[PDB]
């Protein structure tokens, strides 16, 4: 029968017959205790033992979220929505093993995104039944406490220290370091890879000293800690704890007695509050995310990066072509799913204070002027393409580019990619192009299947990036093959080579958006 | 050779040039000397003279302050007057081809000097070559400049402002009533100036009074929409009162203020014009054009947009290093004897000297816009940046913006781009094609081979002479030859212009569109 003896107990999975083969999927193994009762809003502890054999054979609890229903019934909005009922006992992990059980297969651990408030491992696209078989590697998947339950930070106080959600991952990565050799995995060749908050969490694990021995390499897909939304300042994050307690009716006597009120009230009672906690919110506001807790993160991430106090390893970071367009349909004026969404001049201007509330009028006019240099004016699609690039470069494109530039300075091979392919089955309209988060379908090898109505060009592309994603994990270079493939050069600060991922042609280019990103580096900080 | 004018007879020289000869009349009076009572007032028309004027010598130059920054340097004193200074300076010079032509087209030169210096008597302004090779008539002028030519008390005819501009207008009116007897068509007259005549010719397109004195215009590195061209009537009246207390003359009425100012000797007025502006720029026009109500109905930018101007052909153009001539006159780190490599800080200090009143946030905006280098290693790059932020904002962008709005009313605008640096340029090489050195090639000085001008500088000067003259005659700059690029018109959409260099002249599109887009659409906010 199919059972593996953990250093922790016994768990069994299933047979998933894939592509005409088989994989071993142990899905929903706990790596910590149910964080309710006497232990929530705090870091997780190591789980003791179970005597009954654990049936780790169905998607465990998605951790509680504020479920997005701004457009009910639509696929693309309900696609990222958790596939499992919500609660606080949510600290499980999925792991798919290629069958037959391998010898020292390279391990990959996916960190889901969602802006440190949403997201869950149980989603259909975060799944590695493909990656496990096509390249014969082990794929691990985790669920961490998201929102105010894993990122409520009272600095120094153990009862709510901060970045507990990031500590869930550190414990989840510790489980794989303890007992994945029983599954057949190589605890020495372990690659992190995430997206939009996982890529941000992947980068934060390059900083945390407690994780310097728990993985080998990193892959950052449209995310990094130097993004303006990744880490919030300490005495602004500690504040949004006090206003939360002020919100739930808790008057202060000291700073410790208050936490016990935070615990008594209901789970969804407090997630109702993750929207009012920040008054000047914006569609890219992280109301409760990572911060400087002194234990997980010694200082602000930009300081440790500049001083070079991070894990010296090889990374694979890249962005998509139209990251910013996903955030315009959630509040920006004149932007809808069922339009073509043309805008005039100042709906871009007022489309700036929605994303830049605390910026001077000179700052917004500087943003407007720099993104107004038209190649063709009377082109009506100008201002909507401009606003998408404004949100895209400020939040994901440049933060990933300059991170690699600074990471490359310390002498480790880094590779950058630019995803320009729009999937045919993307349910959102065409004006949003290659949208944020819709490249992971290719990363997990979904087009590799013929029954999802994916065209042949996309599956050749999916098999291409799955091969290099896997090759980088085992070897350190995301090479395709030799004697028929386009070489992926290393990114370094002087030439800044990056690889394009599309169906037309995988090209080598230099200095991605160097003219645009210079604004957000050399001028906008001075505004 | 002797002739007769409408107010007497002049007696002119003869100039043996190019083997041929050309007749000159240097120092003809076109206005009564504005001395004593008549100073600060518009020029009064001249009277008959019983004598017969001998126009055989360059007349005196108007009272001005000498550029003594570099004593002994030919480059700084090339623009200093060669005649003795006096207020009796409203004279004009005419050059006429031999034999006397039938109806030769006339070209009137307006000298520059920031409305503070300059004269017709400079060697760079010698028209004896233009009249010989093209058989055209070139007429030079002398107009009052400085306080004695542009003192502005708006409304009061004792000092109404723009008298220097009226000195020009009276000199044009002299041409259309005398040049027919000289051998030229009065109704085919072309105006060409440089950097203050270019701004003056640009102003003659706006004044209804001068609509009848010329046919077409030629602007060289200057326009009325330049930021230094026209002073607002507010501050222009401060500079008048600032000049009063500097000369101990602050009194009740402006009748009494001009009385003492009219009684004080000229250099007591001249030596104090550097203090009328508290925030003095190397391009600070102490006393220039004003919105007086007589020459300019209102501010010039509103007349260009509304459309009450003389509709005709123009020929505008600038050079690629217009701004570097002003960097050695106050900008720190820049100097004439040194490769003027500056740091980033010396670039910011230079910005404060040329942009005193604008924001700090605005100074960082013009900084960041001009640091997208083609090559980051280039140490020269910060030096070249300051040279163009003051070249575009002052000369390049206003000139391009002038023809764009001028041509939009159905007129034929022709834009050039003088790229060649003269081999005889007495200033160092880091300044490139400097502001005001197109004039040597416009007047045809390199054609006399007794000077150290390369052959590549003659055929350039010889070219520029024909096109300038043909534009005066036929309305467009043709050059009669098969192998020479036909200069197309400048319009708002495609924006074609012709560069002028020694190797060959090619045409380009939308000169410095990226840089001026910052000065057109972003700088007026900061
Ligand atoms: C589009 C869904 N996603 C999970 C795809 C992988 C990416 C997360 C995007 N994403 C979403 C978001 C948008 C729509 C639906 C669900 C979540 C979001 C939603 C709210 N209220 C507040 C902040 C964010 C947010 C903040 C930072 C980053 N970096 C990404 C973010
Ligand atoms: C002398 C050379 N020039 C007449 C070219 C033919 C150009 C005049 C440049 N030029 C000069 C200047 C600079 C150095 C030496 C002499 C004059 C100048 C000097 C002072 N104090 C104040 C204003 C200006 C000025 C103002 C506006 C414009 N548009 C040009 C100007
Ligand atoms: C699979 O690979 C792992 C690691 O790649 C091997 O384990 C050890 O790897 C280290 C590298 O740091 C070597 O120094 C050791 O010599 C390796 N072990 C041995 C016994 O040689 C491992 O051997 C491979 N095979 C299995 C079954 O794990
Ligand atoms: C990509 O390049 C790596 C080298 O960086 C190749 O790695 C070698 O792979 C073979 C087995 O395929 C190993 O025996 C070698 O030890 C590897 N070399 C190393 C680790 O330096 C890799 O094969 C390349 N990818 C492909 C598809 O050929
Ligand atoms: C006309 O305006 C000028 C400036 O606009 C006045 O002169 C000076 O302005 C500077 C501006 O920084 C001040 O620092 C000085 O204090 C001003 N001068 C004096 C004497 O206070 C000028 O005063 C104005 N004209 C009149 C007649 O007052
Ligand atoms: C061409 O260059 C020569 C020097 O190489 C100049 O010669 C000088 O000319 C001046 C007249 O301006 C005389 O006073 C000097 O005595 C000459 N020097 C020598 C060494 O002969 C010549 O003048 C230049 N050409 C022109 C037209 O000025
Ligand atoms: C599961 O798959 C394995 C490998 O293909 C096979 O040997 C086994 O018979 C299958 N069924 C069970 C119940 O293990
Ligand atoms: C703290 O939160 C309160 C809530 O309104 C408010 O004073 C402000 O947003 C924060 N103050 C500081 C100093 O961060
Ligand atoms: C797009 O549809 C929205 C729906 O409310 C509307 O507000 C907007 O004006 C439309 N844009 C157009 C028609 O360009
Ligand atoms: C010189 O001027 C005289 C008039 O005095 C004229 O007759 C003659 O043609 C001119 N040119 C010469 C002599 O070459
Ligand atoms: C005026 O100059 C002319 C030039 O030949 C000559 O008659 C004489 O030098 C002057 N005439 C008188 C009357 O002084
Ligand atoms: C100006 O003031 C003086 C002061 O004595 C006076 O005599 C003169 O008549 C006044 N002029 C006018 C025009 O008001
Ligand atoms: C250039 O000359 C000026 C003249 O004072 C000087 O201040 C400046 O430092 C010089 N530049 C260099 C690099 O020496
Ligand atoms: C330039 O214009 C005139 C008048 O229209 C014409 O006679 C002459 O041939 C033209 N020159 C060229 C080169 O076309
Ligand atoms: Cl008035
Ligand atoms: Cl001015
Ligand atoms: Cl008064
Ligand atoms: Cl010849």
Numbering used by the authors:
A (entry chain A): 3 to 529
B (entry chain B): 4 to 529
Can you quote the paper on this entry?
Crystals of the BChES2-propidium complex were grown by cocrystallization in the presence of 1 mM ligand. The structure of the complex was solved at 3.0 Å resolution. It is apparent, because of the absence of a residue equivalent to Trp286 in mAChE (or Trp279 in TcAChE) at the gorge entrance, that propidium binds very differently to BChE and mostly fills the gorge. The phenanthridinium ring is slotted into the groove of the acyl-binding pocket, with the amino group at interaction distance from Trp231 (2.8 Å to the center of the 6-carbon ring) and Ser198-Oγ (3.3 Å), and T-stacked to Phe329. The alkyldiethylmethylammonium moiety extends to Trp82 of the A-site at cation-π interaction distance (3.1 Å between the 6-carbon ring indole center and C5). The second ethyl group of the quaternary center docks against the propidium phenyl group (4 Å to aromatic plane), suggesting an intramolecular cation-π interaction. The propidium phenyl group is oriented toward the P-site residues Tyr332 and Asp70 (C16-CZ 3.6 Å distance and C15-Oε2 3.8 Å distance) providing additional, if not essential, opportunities for interaction. Propidium is a P-site ligand in AChE, but a single bound propidium in BChE extends from the acyl- and choline- binding pockets to the P-site Tyr332.
Acetylcholinesterase (AChE, EC 3.1.1.7) and butyrylcholinesterase (BChE, EC 3.1.1.8) are serine hydrolase enzymes that catalyze the hydrolysis of acetylcholine. X-ray crystallography analysis of these cholinesterases has established that catalysis takes place in a 20-Å deep active site gorge and involves a catalytic triad of serine, histidine, and glutamate residues located near the bottom of the gorge, denoted the acylation or A-site. Among the 10 aromatic residues interacting with ligands in the hAChE gorge, only 4 remain in the human BChE (hBChE) gorge: Tyr332 (Tyr341 in AChE) in the P-site; and Trp82, Phe329 and Trp231 (Trp86, Phe338 and Trp236 in AChE) in the A-site. In the present study, we extend the kinetic study of Macdonald et al. with X-ray structures of BChE in complex with decamethonium, ThT, propidium, huprine 19, and ethopropazine, with kinetic data involving decamethonium and ThT, and with isothermal titration calorimetry (ITC) measurements.
